[PDB]
Amino acid sequence: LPVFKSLRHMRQVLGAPSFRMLAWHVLMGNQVIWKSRDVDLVQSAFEVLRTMLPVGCVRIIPYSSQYEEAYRCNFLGLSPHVQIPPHVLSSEFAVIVEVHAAASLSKYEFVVTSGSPRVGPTILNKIEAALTNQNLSVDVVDQALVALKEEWMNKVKVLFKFTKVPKEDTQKLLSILGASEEDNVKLLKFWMTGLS
């Protein structure tokens, strides 16, 4: 009963700024750390978050008793008293979500942190915007995410096929495809790991 049910639910619970920072890290392939007493809640978090990535981009250690580095996983679950190394705590390339009992999910308080820095990537804005509109049916949200994800994976394919070979050509192509901006370029690079 105390689990995340959707992206939208997760957004309601964590809050808008926190969700956006969390989602940006998921999308870019940065390490996502969840520290909780509750194994199932954490599993539900990952089940929800993974829907934002191509299935090939997911490497999960669901509930570890020690910190594991990024090469080990991009999704990491943790026991409550596990200690996170300083480089992680201050990293701009990881996000930590810590769950505690508070004084759906009312009994928990969530704190989301990351090393301090943005505008994109585009799929994030589009995803956040869909979650935002409370007038959206669940099926619409779900089907839109699938589509959005597919559109972005296609761009990855197009980009891979294209750079099988000037160099300024790539930016030009990307520009037509609406994917020239710095974050979009970073996302495509990461998403390419989800392809052979």
CATH of the domain at 162: 1.10.10.1730
Domain containing 195 equals 118-196
Tokens for 195? 């392809």
Structure resolution in Å?
2.0
Domain stops at, among 117, 152, 167: 117
Q: Are 131 and 38 found together in one domain?
A: no
Q: Are 12 and 61 found together in one domain?
A: yes
Residue type, 17: P
Instruction: Note whether 57 and 74 are within 8 A (CB).
Output: yes
Q: Tell me which long-range contacts 109-115 makes (C-beta under 8 A, separation of at least 24).
A: 110/13, 110/14, 110/15, 110/18, 112/14, 112/18, 112/21, 112/22, 113/89, 114/21, 114/25, 115/89, 115/90, 115/91
